């Protein structure tokens, strides 16, 4: 589980458009799109997107 996502806040400073990014991304992981690369572990796709921001691979 995550205790501090301040890292995500720094990779993408918008903190708003950031939500629109993961917005369309959650859409891909649901309605066709593409499969979630990082093998998920209980964490819904919303949190999975959170993790992808911290790594900064998909923005």
């Amino acid at each position: 589980a995550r205790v501090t996502v301040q890292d995500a806040v720094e990779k993408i400073g918008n903190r708003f458009d950031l939500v629109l990014v993961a917005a369309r991304r959650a859409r891909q992981m649901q309605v066709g799109g593409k499969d979630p690369l990082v093998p998920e572990e209980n964490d819904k796709t919303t949190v999975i997107a959170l993790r992808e921001i911290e790594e900064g691979l998909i923005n």
Binding site: A1, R2, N42, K44, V47
Partner: protein, 49 residues
């Protein structure tokens, strides 16, 4: 499924609550920082620890 307390939904329950950024909001707040967020956990009780 929820109607039968299926052991199935119990595991699934774990998956959707153990990591849910929720808004603990108190309606009568006369201040911005009175509305904050936490992370719910499967707790055996009758109140919000």
């Amino acid at each position: 499924m929820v109607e039968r307390e299926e052991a199935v939904v119990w595991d699934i329950l774990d998956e959707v609550i153990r990591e849910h950024p929720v808004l603990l909001n108190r309606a009568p707040t006369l201040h911005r920082l009175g509305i904050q967020a936490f992370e719910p956990v499967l707790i055996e009780g009758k109140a919000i620890q």
